[PDB]
Structure formats: structure tokens, C-alpha cells
From TrEMBL, chain A:
Ca(2+) 1 binds at residue 174. It comes from Clostridium autoethanogenum. Residues 20-101 form the Carbon monoxide dehydrogenase subunit alpha ,N-terminal domain. This is CO-methylating acetyl-CoA synthase. Ca(2+) 2 binds at residue 182.
Length: 290, 628
């Protein structure tokens, strides 16, 4: 299975999970039931950026699966791969929205789940200033808790805002990593779809700071690529869904670095086994100056 | 039918009609319906019992020549002789280059300009370098290269980029190369009356001969030219007939051998010659190149390219060419007649290529610079005979970027290498983009023009289709010059013609979507590149999604090139049918059975859009075989 086929398989799995969870939400709560994220002004940010539509009820959430379906075209060309990554991102957002409408408190501490607009505005000032020179999106599991803690604290000591997805949260807790918004170590959630909660940070950064109106998807992608200094460090074995989510990160212009053997793409998808050089490799790949 | 897609070509054809001079198009029209027997390859003249012609349609008419040779035998022998002739042309070019290398000296006209390249080549030839004088090394390297041409005992020396698997496959098949002249002689011997009358064996002998061109003759010529005249790097130039200057002396270098054109370029900066050009009433000296010698001087110095093969006559039709200096190969003899209608001095310089009624000034290899200065002085003095009322230079020229040797490509690829990962100075970024599928493949577009095809149409259509399908294109020779004239050799072309993956790659690496890798002998560079990629991936060259295209080929050299490209394991599309349709067995060998032998085969397709589609499908199926 080559890179394109891996991304397409991951996007289809994300679509299947989104369809299942949306069906569950439709069964339990009804199509008139409200759909929203806590304290946001852009409804579902990824769908709002891609199309301009605001998802307000469960029926519209079910109708948002058509966006995911139309974004998956299985032809081995780079544009289709980027669109398939975006389909995975939209599907992950739909899954998170369904989680919020199904459970009153989908995320428990230390996971924070969705990040509200006021937090985005608070982080915007140090973002453009340079006190936050980048965003380290750490996903998966490191071979040890010690190495995960070392990498996370290396990013933290450099001022980067690091977000954690997956078992790396538990490894960092075992590694005595101090977490919080002021400490710049944000645990999003144990599921892969929780990575969307940092993606919407970038998307809304284009909506708030950039002033790009909803539906101008190419302008949003250009803004995230040229303004948001985010990158992905994917540790541990990578499923097709993880690779598809990484394709979404690449579609947003965010390079993906991993310790796994993957079909490398220069400046976009890079393998770095040496955990002692992963921080420097990511800073170089994202062109970050400390 | 239109004669060309190039507007400057069309304006000069109108001028040639107004001036009452004949062109290659006019002679093609005069030839009318060409002989069917010769077109199918079923005519034989190998002995004076003939001429013999057998039916191109099996089961009808005369079946055998007088000696009993079948249509397949006649076709296979004719094809083999074309391969032998092409191999001879390329090998003679490389032999001259090696002899020039052998005569290099510190204080002479010919020096060593790339010592690192010479040391790497010496490593490839098992020549010691440590603690040695550079010219002693150069002479030893030249001796080894010369031995490759005529050794009768032992094995020849092949470049390290050639995969071990490909060499083992050649040895098992029986096509492993011997000395170049020995293989040419073997082909000529086996086509003699009453020798080889088996099509498969004949084709295998021709493949064996073509390998000595691709991997020994052209390769050594290219690498020694780099050693003596400098490795090409990315450089700007201008292309098409508009580069001629009305108010300057115009000196057009046509042919293939680079030593003469290098010495002419050096002589053009001589203060006495510049002063002489001023004194004859010209603003200066304007050197322009055509065909492969133009490609060489343009790759290494940015000399403007006046035009490719079927434009050579039109260069004279402008009435502005004060001197036309030619060495060997692809020099239309009609130029001698044509220059009578203008003031142009048509100067032959090589004992290998005498042309009747041209001015012969033998280029002296013993004193190359002085000889080049004398020839250039004749061209400059001819400026006084210019008739400015007969001058018409089209205001059509195009910016081009070239100089993409393998070394230059590797240097460009270093830009997209993460320093914390590495390694540097490899083809690894290219291998990565090919394996990931961001690039679907790489295609080489090579070859001449041919009056049978609208000039430059097939080259341009094939190149645009390939780059639109995210296939990166490397170009050589007259195809490269067609791309230069059209405007494809530009960074802007990436966003104008390329597909998404290739556009992203071009933006990241800062290269045009079409890479000009030099002259016809520089096709060896392409082999080198492919070999490196294969050696980096641990596979044979036949496992890669690569292809070669000759949309508008005419020469025996093109036949030899396609043969050795296929024998190396690279599928080749021919835009002009070779004279083999009369032999069904030969057609079946070249287009079907060759894949069993060397993993690649010929594709005959005269429609460029269909050729692009077939190339994409073949690359995709090879990718699926490879798992990428
Ligand atoms: S070699 Fe045979 S087929 Fe050819 S001309 Fe002589 S007799 Fe005829």
C-alpha cells in the first residue's frame, strides 16, 4: 500500500467512523437537536472555512458528511491527496461535534478537548510577537515515557506551544511534565480525532487574525501555511487514519515528522528515528528560529 | 500541412519562398511518395547479386532475396546497420574527446577545468590520484578511455552508476558490451551476405553494439568534456532565430564536436578580433549555436541557441549569418548551395566531413586556439560583404534556463534536504518524490526534427502532456532546443503547464519543469541519473517509472540511442516509424519480445497525445509492480 492508498484508506475509515457516530447522534437526540462547540463564534471551524456553512442542528451535521464524501477522490495525484487529508480533517471535526452533542462533558482532565475562541485570542498576541515561535503537535506514543518527556520539555523550554494527542499524554504525565495553557502543554485527547482541536486553532487564526471570510478555503490554507508555525511529530506505529490526518496537516502546510518508516516527501513528510535530534529537525523543517 | 509550429520558422519560410531558395521542406515535397519497399525495410542491397526487394506483406509476392534471405532477415540487417552507424558517430565523437584529454597540459590550449570531476572519473577507471600531478592523472584516464574503444583482451570499463543487476542480465542475455569499434565491426560483419539470417540474434547483436554507445562512447565523451571544459551548472540563455544581430558580426556554430566551439568562444574575446569586428563596421561579435554544438556551448557558457536541425537553412535565409562554422554530423549539405544565394561563408573544419563547394579551413587540434582565431577572423572579415537590404531577422527569441548536469541536479536537490536528517549530495530527494507518488515518473524527450512531422509540434505536445501529468521531463538535443524556443525552459512554466505535484516539486527545488541536460551524447547523463536512482532503491532500471521519447527522430544516432535506452531497461516511444513494418518478426521482437529480454520495449506511436497516455499507463503499471 503506497502513500496515496494509505491516505485514501484512512480517509474512508474516518468517513465510516463519522457516519456511525452521526447515526448514533440522530438515533439518540434527533435532527432538530442543537450542534455546537463550547464558546466559539465559527460553529464548526473546518466546515465553516471549507464551505462557509454553519452547522447548528444534528440534521445539518448529518448533511455535512457529503463534504467528506466529495473531498475523497481516489486518483493518485497530489491535489487529490491533499483533498483527502482535508476530508479526514472534516470527518474528525464531525466526530468531535457528535461527541459534544452526545455527552455533556466528553473530555475529562487532563484532556481539554475543544479550545474556545477567547483562548485563541489570548494566544494570538504571543503568537505573532514571537514568544510562541511554533506549535508542536505531538501525536502517538514514544518508546519510553522518558523520551516523550524529554522532547516535550525541550519544546516547552524553547517557548513553543505543544499539544498532545494519544498515549503521549500518559507518558508525559509519567514524565512529570507540567501541563496547562500557561505552561504551554495542552492535552487535547486520547483519540486521533482530537488532533482536529489544534487544527481549528490554525483555521480560526485565519478567521480571526487573517480576516479571511468563511468559504475562502484556498486563502485559509495559504494563511495557515505562511503564518501558523505548526508541525506534527507522530510517534509510534501509524495507522492509515493517522497517515490521513497527517495528509490533512500537510494540506494546511504543516510538515509531518515521524520516527516511523514512511514514504518521505521532502519538506512535508520526514522520518527522523533519532529522538535526540527530533526537536532540531522539526525546527528546521518548520523554519522556526528560537 | 503546416511546416512548423514556430512563428519565426514560418516568417523565414515565407522569406525563402520570396528569395527563390529551396528548403528541406521543398526537397521533401519533391521526393513525393517515398519508396514503399525502403520505407518498410524489405529492400536489400548488401551484395551485387541484388538489389532485392521482397514483399512487405507476408504470403504475397516475392518472399526471399536472391541469396534466400527472408523479409525478417532483410529488415533485421537493415536495422542493425542503422544501429552500427549511430554507434559509430557517437563513438567517433567520444574518441576525439578522449584524444583531446590525452593532450591536455597546464600551459596548453586544452586544460583541466574540473579537477574533482577528473578525480571521480579516475576512481571509476581505477586510476590512482592521491599525491599525483593532475595532468598525469588526466593522461592515465585518457589512456583507459581510449582502451575502451579498441581493447581485444579483457573486459571494458563501465560507469559505477550502472546497476549490478543490469550487468548480470546483459551477461546472461549475451549482449554484454565489448570494445566499441569491435562491436561496430561485429555488426557490419554479421550483416554481410551469407552470415546472420536469424532476426533474434541480429537484434541482440545490435543491442550489444548500442550499449557501447550509451555507456562507453557517449558517457566518456560527456565526462571528459566536463573535465576539460567544465561541468555545466544552471545558466540563462536565449533561444530561436531572433538572437541574430543585424548590427553585429553573426557567427553560427553548427555540428557536434565541442573542442572547436569552445576554442571559437575563447577566440571571440580576443582583443584583436574584437577590434577587427569594430573596424569592419560591426558593433561586436555575436556567437550563436545550433544543434548539439550549440547545446554544449550553451550549457557551459550561455551561448545563445539560434535553432535546431530543421532550422539550420533558415538561419542563412535571414541574410545576417556572416560565418557558418560546421564540424561533423547533421550538417545538411544543401547549405553549401544555399550560402551561394547570400554572402555567408560556409566553413567546414573537419577532415571527417568535407562538403563540396564549401570553404575548407581544417581545424588544427595541435594549435586549437590559433586555428579557431584564424577561422573566426575569416567570419569577421566577411561582415563587409553583408547586404543589409537582404537582412530580415524575426523579432522572436525566448529566455531559457539550462545547464542541468547530474551534479547540478544534485546540488539543486540539496535545497530540500533537512540538515538534521541528510544525507547531502545524493539523488535521494528525487527518489523520495518518485516513490511517494508526488511525481508519477521521469521521461526523457530526445531526438531530431523530421519533415514527416510538423516541426517541433510532437516535441512540444509530448512535453506539455507529460508535465501536465506530473511527469518530470529531461530534454536533450533538438527536442531540448524546441522546448527552449517554445518557452518551457522557464521557472514560470511550472505554474503554467505542470500538474499539481510537479508544480509543487518545481517550487520547492526552484527548477523549471523541463530540465535541459545537454546534447545527444549528454543522454548518457540521463542514464547516469536513472542508474543512481536505481542504485539508491536497490532495483534494476526496468523497475522504475521512467521512459524515453523520440517524437521526431531522423538520424541513425537516434536509432542507436533508442536501442541502448531500451536495452538498459527503459521503455522508449518513437514518434516516427522506423523501417521495420515489412518484417513481422522484427516488429514482434522490438515491441513485444524485448520486454522478456531486458524488461523494456519499443512503442511506436505517431500521435503525441496517445503517446502521453500510453506513457502514463505504462508508468502506472510499473509503479504497481514496484508497490509505489
Ligand atoms: S544479401 Fe541476399 S537479399 Fe541482400 S541483395 Fe544480396 S542476394 Fe539480395
Amino acid at each position: 500500500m503506497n502513500l496515496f492508498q494509505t491516505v485514501f484508506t484512512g480517509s474512508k475509515q474516518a468517513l465510516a467512523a463519522a457516519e456511525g457516530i452521526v447515526k448514533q447522534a440522530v438515533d439518540e437526540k434527533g435532527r432538530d437537536y442543537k450542534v455546537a462547540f463550547p464558546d466559539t463564534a465559527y460553529s464548526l471551524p473546518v466546515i465553516f472555512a471549507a464551505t462557509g456553512k454553519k452547522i447548528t442542528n444534528v440534521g445539518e451535521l448529518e448533511g455535512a458528511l457529503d463534504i467528506v464524501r466529495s473531498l475523497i477522490v481516489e486518483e493518485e495525484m497530489l491535489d487529490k491527496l491533499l483533498n483527502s487529508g482535508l476530508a479526514t480533517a472534516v470527518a474528525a471535526e464531525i466526530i468531535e461535534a457528535a461527541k459534544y452533542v452526545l455527552s455533556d462533558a466528553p473530555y475529562a482532565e487532563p484532556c481539554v478537548g475543544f479550545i474556545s475562541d477567547p483562548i485563541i485570542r489570548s494566544l494570538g498576541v504571543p503568537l505573532v510577537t514571537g514568544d510562541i515561535p511554533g506549535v508542536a503537535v505531538i501525536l502517538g506514543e514514544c518508546p519510553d515515557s522518558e523520551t516523550a518527556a524529554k522532547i516535550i520539555k525541550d519544546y516547552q523550554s524553547k517557548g513553543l506551544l505543544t499539544c498532545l494527542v494519544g498515549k503521549v499524554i500518559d507518558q508525559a504525565i509519567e514524565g512529570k511534565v507540567k501541563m496547562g495553557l500557561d505552561l504551554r502543554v495542552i492535552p487535547l485527547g486520547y483519540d486521533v480525532t482530537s488532533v482536529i482541536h489544534v487544527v481549528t486553532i490554525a483555521i480560526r487564526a485565519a478567521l480571526i487574525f487573517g480576516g479571511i471570510k468563511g468559504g475562502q478555503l484556498n486563502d485559509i490554507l495559504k494563511y495557515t501555511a505562511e503564518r501558523v508555525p505548526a508541525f506534527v511529530n507522530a510517534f509510534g506505529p501509524l495507522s492509515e487514519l493517522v497517515v490521513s490526518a497527517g495528509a490533512g496537516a500537510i494540506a494546511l502546510g504543516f510538515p509531518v515528522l515521524t520516527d516511523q518508516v514512511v514514504p518521505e516527501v521532502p519538506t512535508l513528510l520526514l522520518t527522523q528515528k533519532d529522538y535526540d535530534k527530533m526537536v532540531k529537525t522539526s525546527l528546521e523543517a518548520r523554519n522556526i528560529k528560537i | 500541412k503546416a511546416k512548423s509550429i514556430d512563428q519565426a520558422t514560418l516568417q523565414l519560410l515565407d522569406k525563402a519562398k520570396q528569395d527563390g531558395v529551396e528548403t528541406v521542406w521543398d526537397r521533401k515535397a519533391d521526393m513525393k511518395v517515398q519508396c514503399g519497399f525502403g520505407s518498410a525495410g524489405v529492400c536489400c542491397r548488401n551484395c551485387s547479386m541484388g538489389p532485392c526487394r521482397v514483399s512487405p506483406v507476408p504470403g504475397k509476392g516475392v518472399e526471399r532475396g536472391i541469396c534466400g534471405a527472408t523479409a525478417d532477415v532483410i529488415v533485421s540487417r537493415n536495422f542493425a546497420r542503422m544501429v552500427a552507424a549511430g554507434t559509430a558517430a557517437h563513438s567517433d565523437h567520444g574518441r576525439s574527446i578522449a584524444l583531446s584529454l590525452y593532450h591536455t597540459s597546464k600551459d596548453g590550449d586544452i586544460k583541466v577545468k574540473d579537477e574533482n570531476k577528473l578525480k571521480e572519473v579516475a576512481k571509476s577507471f581505477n586510476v590512482e590520484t592521491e599525491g599525483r600531478d593532475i595532468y598525469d592523472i588526466a593522461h592515465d584516464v585518457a589512456k583507459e578511455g581510449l582502451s575502451n574503444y579498441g581493447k581485444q583482451l579483457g573486459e571494458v570499463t563501465l560507469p559505477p552508476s550502472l546497476p549490478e543487476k543490469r550487468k548480470e542480465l546483459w551477461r546472461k542475455l549475451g549482449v554484454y558490451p565489448r570494445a566499441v569499434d569491435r562491436e561496430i565491426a561485429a555488426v557490419m560483419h554479421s550483416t554481410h551476405i551469407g552470415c546472420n539470417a536469424d532476426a533474434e540474434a541480429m537484434i541482440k547483436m545490435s543491442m550489444r553494439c548500442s550499449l557501447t554507445d550509451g555507456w562507453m562512447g557517449s558517457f566518456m565523451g560527456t565526462e571528459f568534456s566536463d573535465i576539460m571544459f567544465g561541468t555545466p551548472h544552471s545558466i540563462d540563455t536565449e533561444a530561436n532565430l531572433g538572437v541574430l544581430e543585424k548590427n553585429s558580426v553573426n557567427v553560427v556554430l553548427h555540428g557536434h564536436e565541442p573542442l572547436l566551439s569552445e576554442m571559437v568562444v575563447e577566440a571571440a574575446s580576443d582583443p584583436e578580433l574584437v577590434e577587427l569586428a569594430k573596424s569592419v563596421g560591426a558593433d561586436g561579435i555575436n556567437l550563436c549555436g545550433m544543434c548539439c554544438t550549440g547545446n554544449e556551448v550553451s550549457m557551459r557558457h550561455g551561448i545563445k541557441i539560434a535553432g535546431n536541425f530543421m532550422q539550420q537553412e533558415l538561419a542563412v535565409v535571414t541574410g545576417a549569418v556572416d560565418g557558418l562554422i560546421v564540424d561533423v554530423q547533421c550538417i545538411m549539405p544543401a547549405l553549401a548551395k544555399l550560402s551561394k544565394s547570400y554572402h555567408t561563408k560556409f566553413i567546414t573544419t573537419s577532415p571527417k566531413a568535407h562538403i563540396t563547394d564549401s570553404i575548407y579551413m581544417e581545424f588544427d587540434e595541435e594549435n586549437p586556439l590559433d586555428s579557431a582565431k584564424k577561422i573566426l577572423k575569416e567570419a569577421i572579415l566577411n561582415f563587409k560583404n553583408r547586404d543589409q537590404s537582404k537582412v530580415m531577422i524575426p523579432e522572436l527569441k525566448c529566455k531559457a534556463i539550462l545547464g542541468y548536469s547530474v551534479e547540478e541536479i544534485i546540488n539543486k536537490l540539496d535545497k530540500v534536504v533537512n540538515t538534521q536528517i541528510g544525507p547531502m549530495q545524493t539523488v535521494k530527494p528525487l527518489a523520495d518524490v518518485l516513490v511517494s507518488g508526488v511525481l508519477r515518473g521521469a521521461a526523457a524527450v530526445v531526438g531530431c526534427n523530421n519533415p514527416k512531422v510538423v516541426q517541433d509540434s510532437a516535441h512540444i505536445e509530448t512535453i506539455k502532456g507529460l508535465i501536465k501529468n506530473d511527469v518530470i521531463v529531461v530534454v536533450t538535443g533538438c527536442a531540448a532546443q524546441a522546448a527552449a524556443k517554445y518557452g518551457l525552459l522557464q521557472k514560470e512554466a511550472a505554474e503554467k503547464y505542470a500538474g499539481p505535484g510537479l508544480a509543487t516539486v518545481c517550487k520547492l527545488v526552484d527548477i523549471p519543469p523541463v530540465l535541459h541536460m545537454g546534447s545527444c551524447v549528454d543522454i548518457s547523463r540521463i542514464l547516469d541519473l536513472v542508474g543512481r536512482v536505481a542504485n539508491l532503491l536497490g532495483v534494476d532500471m526496468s523497475d522504475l517509472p521512467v521512459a524515453g521519447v523520440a517524437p521526431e527522430w531522423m538520424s541513425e544516432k537516434a536509432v542507436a540511442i533508442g536501442t541502448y535506452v531500451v536495452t538498459s531497461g527503459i521503455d522508449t516511444w518513437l514518434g516516427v516509424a522506423p523501417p521495420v513494418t515489412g518484417g513481422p518478426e522484427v516488429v514482434d521482437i522490438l515491441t513485444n519480445k524485448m520486454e522478456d529480454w531486458v524488461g523494456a520495449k519499443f512503442f511506436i506511436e505517431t500521435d503525441p497525445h496517445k503517446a502521453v497516455e500510453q506513457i502514463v499507463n505504462r508508468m502506472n503499471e510499473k509503479r504497481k509492480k514496484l508497490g509505489i
